[PDB]
Design a protein around this ligand. Structure first.
Ligand SMILES: O=C(Nc1cccc(NS(=O)(=O)c2ccc3oc4cc([N+](=O)[O-])ccc4c3c2)c1)C1(O)CC1
Ligand SMILES: O=C(Nc1cccc(NS(=O)(=O)c2ccc3oc4cc([N+](=O)[O-])ccc4c3c2)c1)C1(O)CC1
Ligand SMILES: O=C(Nc1cccc(NS(=O)(=O)c2ccc3oc4cc([N+](=O)[O-])ccc4c3c2)c1)C1(O)CC1
Ligand SMILES: O=C(Nc1cccc(NS(=O)(=O)c2ccc3oc4cc([N+](=O)[O-])ccc4c3c2)c1)C1(O)CC1
Lengths: 329, 328, 329, 329
């Protein structure tokens, strides 16, 4: 009789209930993976990418580390059969713009990649929520939505979750207040064209615009426009100094994963289908405050925007549809 | 009146749990992210010589830390940012080049530590030093000698990770979760490490009692293959991925947790071993140590066989053989 | 040679860095104690009360349970020397109003008890923050402030922290929103006279009063006044059904302890010195949004109140000073 | 249009995945409940007891407190339909021995109560794990097993989980070691007749009995028998000083709930069906080291016991069967 049989009497022998997949194990993917592991969101974690050596190596490195956590099942493969029955699938894979390549051609190359990834994801996890991180995130959330045929509640983009956190932080810096005691959103298109919603900014329900009506206008003696500028410059300076951004996006994605996996029903400014709002008729995605839970987006908060704020979202929607209508599925 | 003064009436205008990570390579930043997310530090300092990359990593962490219990994160090539650290983690060093001798490699690491350690000591004289840089047993000695710190405040990451791997694979053999297995890998980090079969148990039922031939050459179950797989485990990560980051990061974070939160948990870490197992020389090896707010408060005196004592004694001789030739 | 000396070689020997004291081990005190233990806020916990048997029994019951937590040092005694070097001291002890006793006489009996407790606390922990839970909490926070001679930043009352949470919850119930995604305060005097600040109530920075200006008035077709009424009736119905309230106050106190012990700089509507605000000239304490951290109250948020809201706080301040000025120290 | 419809656009209108029931809202029940809430083990918590006022009052007090936690769904009722689809059902209800009542009559009164409780539990949660806390726990685990007809893996008693923790602590005290770095079990019948397994006691795999073979015998110069005595006296001294034990059992039960609800596969000395082991032929339950996970007891660790240790378990088994065979189902 073996040592196993002398030491252990077994009574019985199952399926995971909180499985997350990360597609793409570049810097961003693995930052998402380590952040998710350490918030203990998943009882099974699956990693998928096309370079088989690097992929298995990352799986093993995580596994060994995970001996010092609440150790989950970690699997990996180029084959999407390892992603079966995921509650949440996080897409970080994509193509980066090359010198002399047009925006249209770049998005089309991303579309062609998603035409392989998304149907494979849907085949193996038909009930999953899709969280799109790949840039440009507003367009590629649309792309994932179109190819998956999923309802709008189960297709989310990382959107302005991180930029809103940055905005809240710098707002705090101006007021001598911790970022956690500040509220305010950056909405619309992820990046340069994003909209600082001044009306919504408050500390303890005391709205900033009420006390200082010139906040965010050209006539602003305190020049709060410089805050939103610094939010945008913030991301570029990380890339200039370090080469790329990993930790910041990783922890923003983990924040969204937490709200979904633990049904927290917290508000996040994430890329969602925006048709019907702000005089937008086209099938585009932009960031508005959404309530995230176990079925993805359960509700939108209907933010009242000024004339100028509506114009900026409308302009972004036009630009995005301008590209989306030229894409070939 | 400004918006600030209309909104906020201010009444009032040092960190108690400051950690420094020296070196922001893959291992350093894996230590940093793992420490941040276990919420161990109210201030985190990063130090390295490449100024751009360093500031970039600080900023990336800072922005991410908006989704955690946000601590103060600072960075610089200047060690003045490390002032009043409770714990300083050394990951910096030099890697062996093809045809470079062990002695020359350690000497290049010694020359680097002759800059790092005195700067650390200047700014955090009461800190615990945790050495991760390889080879870890020798470089823990190096840090000890240059710092002049007492043996309790100079620790090497040692066999903390390898012991976890060992416990896991032991579990795999027995059909048991790694957390319900006990057992250590002691001595020199790497190929020469010692699987202590006597100590291996599940729920206080010792494996060697039920199967006395466990770990010998005449072992019909061949438990020697378990320790072999622990060592091959680390190499296969390097072959497949290029380097190891996440595994060492989380092992270091485990040790940081025990120290920063005064958990008084047992870890097989590199500590001064002179006096034990008939070792006369000033060498460091991994034995079970109780880690808390003052570093190593106690050793557990593990009874070793003749063969186990011989392997530690041999490692100690090899290590002293190199240590005595180093120039400080 | 002993088993101890054969097994363990000792290298060194200490003092606690995160010590909390709970004064009073009635239902409220022990609810505070268990809630604080299990949020892992304290490396030393001290319990103080006058009934020696019950006190030691509660200490031992906690100690044995704490073997399944990050086990802290737990001490107890009638002698305040066990409270030495507390960062935070929580006062739950006091006297309860008897049939035919006047409010003034009750407060005076509480003053006489605090004239024993507070100087003993101050003797042994001169740098501690005082958190007052004992009712009536606004007056007894003043009493603790006067006897301690502590600066206003280190003397806090549990105030409207719980009632505000209840308010946010019921606001959420009306809107079909999770309590965590609702904002709004109940300010002023703890209990019946507390003020629902309608102006501050919002979801994702969209203020409720903007969309529905009649919110909280007598001509409110949705009758949001019933929400604040239910917050007040809520507490009485617990007392009628169960006999007393323990768990709710315990977890509210633990919330405040967390912000203080972990320097979170989170906003809580707690009883603080209100002289200078809302045309109040007297030394009274009422609940306004305060930022809590390792030095207690670091900042107040200056909430803009309507004429009627100012009147209600002013009236409470007058009533409280009316009693405070008749007290004998 | 209502304020709700102006503020929130809803996309979706579910079932709990981690539901726990606590039967009995006495001191022990509510200590289990608060401890389970604060380790965040349940997304739905159900409380059941026969006194309707007290029950609803405790539910409301918990609910209000839970606004400062990851707020779960909390329900209550005398009707077991509130317990539907529980993963784990914790039984604390039962009868206490009255003056001049025989042990047999007491157990029979507990059996008669379980003949109402257990079939109602099984009806509404047929796949649940049963955790029995009610004393005497080894007999009432058997009673629950017989009435439920559940397999032995899904019927567990709190057993020697707490007493083993106490033992480990006092072992640590002798060696100058933190309780977390000590290992050792107290096995068999809960209470006076429990067996300190000296062979299993170790620090870092260095077995105490190897260094000191006289450990636990009458000619032990260090008198380690006094340690097990103090474990037993420990529980009585809490009852003498305070009146009852709540916090200690609450946190022991929460420890077991954690291992089950989070599939930790940790070893606990819990009451399980012991027929086949240690020359025991009868259907009795005693504490042996069991691996607890999402399906309850997945494995036993087969502890080698001395002749004297086998005799003590055999004697307990005889005593327990002596009573069990006289019970009327
Ligand atoms: O309390 C403050 N800040 C605060 C509070 C808690 C922790 C920290 N730590 S930190 O300095 O390391 C820090 C922590 C997180 C941070 O996110 C930032 C984002 C930007 N930006 O331009 O996008 C700039 C700076 C940060 C940033 C800085 C800083 C104040 O801003 C002084 C009120
Ligand atoms: O239950 C088991 N394992 C288990 C328990 C809980 C989680 C996991 N997750 S995992 O498969 O992803 C995993 C998780 C962690 C792991 O660490 C490992 C180390 C080595 N090694 O050679 O050092 C090899 C494999 C692992 C390893 C694997 C694995 C058993 O081994 C079957 C008893
Ligand atoms: O999502 C909601 N509620 C919700 C969210 C998460 C958990 C729960 N759980 S619970 O129903 O058990 C619960 C949880 C906490 C609760 O606090 C309450 C306070 C009062 N009150 O009179 O002040 C009344 C009821 C509660 C209350 C109820 C309830 C909505 O209110 C429907 C939006
Ligand atoms: O470090 C130790 N103990 C320790 C470590 C960390 C925290 C504490 N806290 S405590 O003193 O408040 C405490 C904490 C937990 C405790 O469990 C106990 C059980 C018994 N018993 O008779 O069953 C008696 C006492 C305790 C007991 C005491 C105690 C040592 O016992 C000296 C090794």
């Amino acid at each position: 009789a073996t040592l196993k049989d002398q030491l252990i009497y077994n009574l019985l022998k199952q399926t995971p209930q909180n499985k997350i997949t990360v597609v793409g194990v570049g810097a961003v993917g693995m930052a998402c993976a380590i952040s998710i592991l350490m918030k203990d969101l998943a009882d099974e974690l699956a990693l998928v990418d096309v370079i088989e050596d690097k992929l298995k190596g990352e799986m093993m490195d995580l596994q060994h580390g995970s001996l010092f956590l609440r150790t989950p099942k970690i699997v990996s493969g180029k084959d999407y059969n390892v992603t079966a029955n995921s509650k949440l699938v996080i897409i970080t894979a994509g193509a980066r713009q090359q010198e002399g390549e047009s925006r249209l051609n770049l998005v089309q190359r991303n579309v062609n990649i998603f035409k392989f990834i998304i149907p494979n994801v849907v085949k193996y996890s038909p009930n999953c929520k899709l969280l799109i991180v790949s840039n440009p995130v507003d367009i590629l959330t649309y792309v994932a939505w179109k190819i998956s045929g999923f309802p709008k509640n189960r297709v989310i983009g990382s959107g302005c979750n991180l930029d809103s956190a940055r905005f809240r932080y710098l707002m705090g810096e101006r007021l001598g207040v911790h970022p956690l005691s500040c509220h305010g959103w950056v909405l619309g298109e992820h990046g340069d064209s994003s909209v600082p919603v001044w009306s919504g900014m408050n500390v303890a329900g005391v709205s900033l615009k009420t006390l200082h009506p010139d906040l965010g206008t050209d006539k602003d003696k305190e020049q709060w426009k410089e805050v939103h500028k610094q939010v945008v410059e913030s991301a570029y300076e990380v890339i200039k100094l370090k080469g790329y951004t990993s930790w910041a996006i990783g922890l923003s994605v983990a924040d969204l994963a937490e709200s979904i996996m633990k049904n927290l029903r917290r508000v996040h400014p994430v890329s969602t289908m925006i048709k019907g709002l702000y005089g937008i008729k086209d099938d585009v995605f932009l960031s508005v405050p959404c309530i995230l839970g176990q079925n993805g987006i359960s509700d939108l908060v209907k933010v009242t925007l000024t004339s100028e704020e509506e114009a900026r979202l409308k302009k972004s929607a036009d630009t995005l549809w301008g590209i989306q209508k030229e894409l070939q599925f």
